[PDB]
Amino acid sequence: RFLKVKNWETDVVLTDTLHLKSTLETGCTEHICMGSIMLPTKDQLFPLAKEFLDQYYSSIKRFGSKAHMDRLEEVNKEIESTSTYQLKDTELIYGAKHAWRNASRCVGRIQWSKLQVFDARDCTTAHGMFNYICNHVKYATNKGNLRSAITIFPQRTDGKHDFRVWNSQLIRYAGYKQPDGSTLGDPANVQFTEICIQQGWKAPRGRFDVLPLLLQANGNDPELFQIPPELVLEVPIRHPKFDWFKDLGLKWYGLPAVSNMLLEIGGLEFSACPFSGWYMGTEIGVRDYCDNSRYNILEEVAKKMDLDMRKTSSLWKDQALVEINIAVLYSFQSDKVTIVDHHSATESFIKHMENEYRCRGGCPADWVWIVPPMSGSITPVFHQEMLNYRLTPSFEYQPDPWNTHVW
Amino acid sequence: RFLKVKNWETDVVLTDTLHLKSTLETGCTEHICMGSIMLPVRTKDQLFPLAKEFLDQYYSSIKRFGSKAHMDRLEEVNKEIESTSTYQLKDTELIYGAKHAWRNASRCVGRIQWSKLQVFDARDCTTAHGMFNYICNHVKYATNKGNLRSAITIFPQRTDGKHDFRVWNSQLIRYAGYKQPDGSTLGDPANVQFTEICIQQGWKAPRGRFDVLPLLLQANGNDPELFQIPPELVLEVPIRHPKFDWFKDLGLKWYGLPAVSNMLLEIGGLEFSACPFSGWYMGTEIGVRDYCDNSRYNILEEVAKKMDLDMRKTSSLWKDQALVEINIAVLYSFQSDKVTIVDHHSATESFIKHMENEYRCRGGCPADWVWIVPPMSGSITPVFHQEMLNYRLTPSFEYQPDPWNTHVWKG
Ligand code: HEM
Ligand code: HEM
Ligand SMILES: N=C(Nc1ccc(CCNCc2cccc(NC(=N)c3cccs3)c2)cc1)c1cccs1
Numbered sequence: 001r002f003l004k005v006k007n008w009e010t011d012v013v014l015t016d017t018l019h020l021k022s023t024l025e026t027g028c029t030e031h032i033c034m035g036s037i038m039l040p041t042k043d044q045l046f047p048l049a050k051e052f053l054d055q056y057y058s059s060i061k062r063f064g065s066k067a068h069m070d071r072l073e074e075v076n077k078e079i080e081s082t083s084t085y086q087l088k089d090t091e092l093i094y095g096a097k098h099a100w101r102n103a104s105r106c107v108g109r110i111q112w113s114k115l116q117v118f119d120a121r122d123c124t125t126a127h128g129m130f131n132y133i134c135n136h137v138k139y140a141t142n143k144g145n146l147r148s149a150i151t152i153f154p155q156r157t158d159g160k161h162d163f164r165v166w167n168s169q170l171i172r173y174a175g176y177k178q179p180d181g182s183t184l185g186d187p188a189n190v191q192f193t194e195i196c197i198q199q200g201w202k203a204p205r206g207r208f209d210v211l212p213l214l215l216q217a218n219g220n221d222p223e224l225f226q227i228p229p230e231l232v233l234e235v236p237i238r239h240p241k242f243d244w245f246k247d248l249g250l251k252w253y254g255l256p257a258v259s260n261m262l263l264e265i266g267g268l269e270f271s272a273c274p275f276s277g278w279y280m281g282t283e284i285g286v287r288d289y290c291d292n293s294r295y296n297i298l299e300e301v302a303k304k305m306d307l308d309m310r311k312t313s314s315l316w317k318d319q320a321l322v323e324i325n326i327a328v329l330y331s332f333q334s335d336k337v338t339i340v341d342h343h344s345a346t347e348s349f350i351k352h353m354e355n356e357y358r359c360r361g362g363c364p365a366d367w368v369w370i371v372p373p374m375s376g377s378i379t380p381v382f383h384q385e386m387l388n389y390r391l392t393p394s395f396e397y398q399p400d401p402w403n404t405h406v407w
Numbered sequence: 408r409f410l411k412v413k414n415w416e417t418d419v420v421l422t423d424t425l426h427l428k429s430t431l432e433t434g435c436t437e438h439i440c441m442g443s444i445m446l447p448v449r450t451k452d453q454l455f456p457l458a459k460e461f462l463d464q465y466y467s468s469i470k471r472f473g474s475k476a477h478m479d480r481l482e483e484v485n486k487e488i489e490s491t492s493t494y495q496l497k498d499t500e501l502i503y504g505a506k507h508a509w510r511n512a513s514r515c516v517g518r519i520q521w522s523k524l525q526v527f528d529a530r531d532c533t534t535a536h537g538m539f540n541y542i543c544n545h546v547k548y549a550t551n552k553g554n555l556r557s558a559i560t561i562f563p564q565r566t567d568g569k570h571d572f573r574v575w576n577s578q579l580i581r582y583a584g585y586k587q588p589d590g591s592t593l594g595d596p597a598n599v600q601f602t603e604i605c606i607q608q609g610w611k612a613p614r615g616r617f618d619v620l621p622l623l624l625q626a627n628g629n630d631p632e633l634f635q636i637p638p639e640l641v642l643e644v645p646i647r648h649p650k651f652d653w654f655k656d657l658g659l660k661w662y663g664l665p666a667v668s669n670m671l672l673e674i675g676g677l678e679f680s681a682c683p684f685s686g687w688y689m690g691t692e693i694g695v696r697d698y699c700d701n702s703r704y705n706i707l708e709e710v711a712k713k714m715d716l717d718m719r720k721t722s723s724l725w726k727d728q729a730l731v732e733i734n735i736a737v738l739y740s741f742q743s744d745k746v747t748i749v750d751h752h753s754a755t756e757s758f759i760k761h762m763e764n765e766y767r768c769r770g771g772c773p774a775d776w777v778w779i780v781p782p783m784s785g786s787i788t789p790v791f792h793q794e795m796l797n798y799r800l801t802p803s804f805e806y807q808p809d810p811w812n813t814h815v816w817k818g
């Protein structure tokens with residue numbers, strides 16, 4: 001019931017108790033581990049509300065005060081009457097910061113307490129949503145000095161008036177299937193790109209076309225909006241040694257901003273809650289650029305480097321991978337757009353785990369996601385035992401809106 | 408019940424039913440995943456069901472389930488258990504059991520090879536000198552002048568737990584480690600404690616950076632005894648780089664034959680506490696882990712200095728650059744000397760084909776993602792993108808406590 005995690009490089013052992021608070025289920029059982037699977041009423045609501053308010057009042061050292069008891073009663077009376085309740089601003093801020101704190105797949109959580117929370121619960125239309133979003137993009141971008149932020153649209157009601165951003169990230173590139181059978185642009189976004197087109201977007205049909213936003217307010221049909229180009233900070237990718245690299249014509253955007261997740265606080269569900277931070281270099285260089293199902297540029301780069309591509313054992317893929325990632329980091333740094341390398345990010349996360357173990361009694365972490373997609377064992381997280389469990393408030397996956405929406 | 412796994416690169420979806428045969432527990436529950444935790448004397452009572460389930464599996468594999476031979480064997484094992492408290496495996500069952508323990512090893516990326524395993528039966532062994540001889544024969548056989556062949560040697564099973572056979576070495580061939588008065592380590596830091604036990608037992612340490620450790624062998628629960636492997640049987644590869652001529656002057660080498668000697672083999676309830684097995688290396692084991700772990704040889708700094716990389720900031724990726732060059736060096740060296748090695752690209756590609764094969768013919772393939780994905784260049788290998796289900800099947804290889812922690816010294 002009290003669990004130990006060991007770091008095998010430093011021998012440091014931590015004891016975890018925080019997991020006993022866990023309420024949600026993992027997918028695993030005593031007989032089978034599913035650690036590597038990507039996706040494993042009035043009655044229901046009051047316990048969820050009480051669990052949340054208890055931790056909130058505990059966090060401000062007011063557990064069991066009249067202010068605590070009164071709030072419990074007020075929310076209780078509100079659920080009984082309205083079948084829902086509203087969070088105070090202070091609770092909403094706390095809940096959003098803790099959903100990040102609890103995100104077991106996030107290596108950047110040393111930052112969790114510095115999150116700017118934009119309350120967009122007064123929003124009613126897609127144009128209103130667009131305005132909030134552009135304001136978020138501009139705030140977070142901060143001319144390259146990126147700042148973490150979340151914008152929180154109205155909470156789920158009867159479920160037929162959902163607010164949704166249809167985009168998977170606020171800023172992402174289009175993918176087009178070609179007459180050839182090849183793919184132009186980002187193949188991850190082919191389907192959404194076609195949804196935009198069929199909704200009415202005039203696609204440039206290039207390699208790096210910023211997708212328009214598709215915004216759904218109040219369960220209404222979603223509407224298209226172009227993000228002002230001036231708000232989309234982009235980085236041309238060059239190499240500090242290889243002159244020819246810039247002629248690959250690579251670029252990426254500076255602001256990573258997830259927009260398809262669901263934020264759960266105190267049993268209330270926020271289906272539109274776009275949040276942003278900044279990139280770890282490997283996300284672009286290893287995953288966006290080198291995944292076979294993504295821009296898949298390893299072949300073209302290795303050719304420019306004149307490496308022996310005859311045999312896998314020459315490690316030509318590995319050599320080309322390192323250079324692509326050097327270029328990504330060099331380009332962002334040269335343009336003064338915030339980025340973190342995997343060495344620095346993982347070192348930070350280890351320090352964060354140690355803070356959380358002493359200040360909180362644990363830190364849920366999903367090793368499969370936390371270890372970087374290159375150079376695993378030369379980062380300290382590789383050698384760190386981690387316990388994965390689900391705490392609330394949380395960010396959760398939700399079905400893509402096009403399978404769900406009734407037009 | 409059916410469980411599906413998806414490859415996120417190919418969209419190939421697989422359906423697992425083999426997990427239904429799993430009995431041993433994982434460490435995980437509905438409320439906690441322990442998938443990254445390194446480590447998460449039987450009665451007659453528990454023994455016959457274990458034996459029965461094993462023999463049912465064996466008889467099924469040879470297409471003789473329910474035959475007169477199957478039934479007579481069950482009855483004979485039953486009689487042997489209730490009268491002698493244990494039983495003996497037939498040679499064929501032993502071979503089947505050792506191969507299946509490998510087939511079932513969820514942390515093993517080399518399992519495409521599982522059916523080609525040379526099994527040496529050393530159950531007639533009685534003394535440490537007998538064990539030494541068996542082990543030398545195994546090394547010579549497996550080494551085969553560089554053309555490595557997989558093999559396992561199986562010493563007598565546990566009886567009362569007071570007469571265990573044990574190889575104290577963690578691998579048959581491994582380098583010594585020496586902690587100096589100034590707190591630095593000479594040689595391999597992983598083997599410091601074991602090196603210290605060898606010295607105490609009487610080993611004359613050469614005290615260099617790559618001294619092959621003596622074997623420390625325990626027969627029949629007796630105090631272990633020291634033996635030196637004949638150096639002529641220990642194939643070693645000097646490490647050089649195809650382009651960087653200064654690489655050789657780092658003075659690096661490694662042994663060709665990886666041979667695990669500290670695991671326990673469980674077949675039909677029987678426990679084989681000394682069962683050394685060997686195959687060949689995947690390059691990253693040496694180049695990433697043995698050479699570049701901070702707690703091992705730790706050569707990254709010296710390599711990047713010699714490459715004159717920018718080391719002032721981690722964001723130059725000097726470590727990642729030095730890492731690739733060392734791993735190229737390892738593969739180049741082994742290939743040039745004609746010693747079997749597999750690169751992590753080839754090994755993971757083969758594993759994915761193995762795994763798909765197993766899903767089709769066997770109904771599943773238990774795999775531990777944390778272990779299967781190589782320690783460098785993770786996502787450019789196909790396993791990174793493969794969902795895997797981890798569960799425990801018997802026969803199996805298991806960890807066991809280091810023998811110096813539990814041994815009753817006779818003096
Ligand atoms: C401040 C800089 C941050 C860094 C460097 C960072 C780093 C990362 C990285 C690298 C991932 C893996 C993504 C992938 O492989 O697809 C991730 C996952 C995640 N992070 Fe962050 N993070 C940051 C800030 C944030 C913020 C501000 C939030 C929310 C408020 C957040 C919540 C998450 C969540 C929920 C996941 C998991 C997503 C999923 O399961 O698909 N992170 N983090
Ligand atoms: C034929 C060539 C083989 C290759 C390339 C290979 C590859 C590997 C590698 C790279 C590991 C991980 C080692 C580590 O990180 O510590 C491993 C684990 C393992 N393999 Fe193999 N393997 C081979 C043959 C064998 C054989 C012959 C057996 C036994 C009959 C075996 C049983 C295991 C077991 C039990 C583990 C898990 C060890 C542990 O949990 O500590 N493998 N395999
Ligand atoms: N369809 C897929 N499934 C899939 C499932 C889950 C996800 C989650 C990806 N999330 C994007 C993300 C989330 C969190 C952080 C980041 N990166 C960042 N640095 C930040 C974003 C926001 C704050 S920090 C990116 C992606 C694909 C595939 C993946 C690969 C090939 S296909």
Ligand SMILES: N=C(Nc1ccc(CCNCc2cccc(NC(=N)c3cccs3)c2)cc1)c1cccs1
Binds near residue numbers: 008445666667688689
């Ligand atoms: N003491 C540790 N704990 C630890 C726990 C388990 C293991 C297991 C190591 N197993 C060695 C091994 C096993 C299986 C295969 C190989 N390599 C091979 N290619 C083969 C060996 C035999 C057949 S194939 C090596 C090692 C250390 C630490 C490691 C790193 C920092 S601390």
Ligand SMILES: C[C@H](O)[C@H](O)[C@H]1CNc2nc(N)[nH]c(=O)c2N1
Binds near residue numbers: 036038370793794795
């Ligand atoms: C199947 C496997 O779980 C999947 O490929 C995971 C592995 N680890 C990951 N880690 C991160 N950070 N992001 C991912 O998308 C993945 N993909």
Ligand SMILES: C[C@H](O)[C@H](O)[C@H]1CNc2nc(N)[nH]c(=O)c2N1
Binds near residue numbers: 444
């Ligand atoms: C804590 C973590 O589970 C530990 O470092 C593991 C990770 N994956 C591994 N994978 C392999 N093949 N070998 C290992 O020793 C490890 N170590």
Ligand SMILES: [Zn+2]
Binds near residue numbers: 029032033440441
């Ligand atoms: Zn698990």
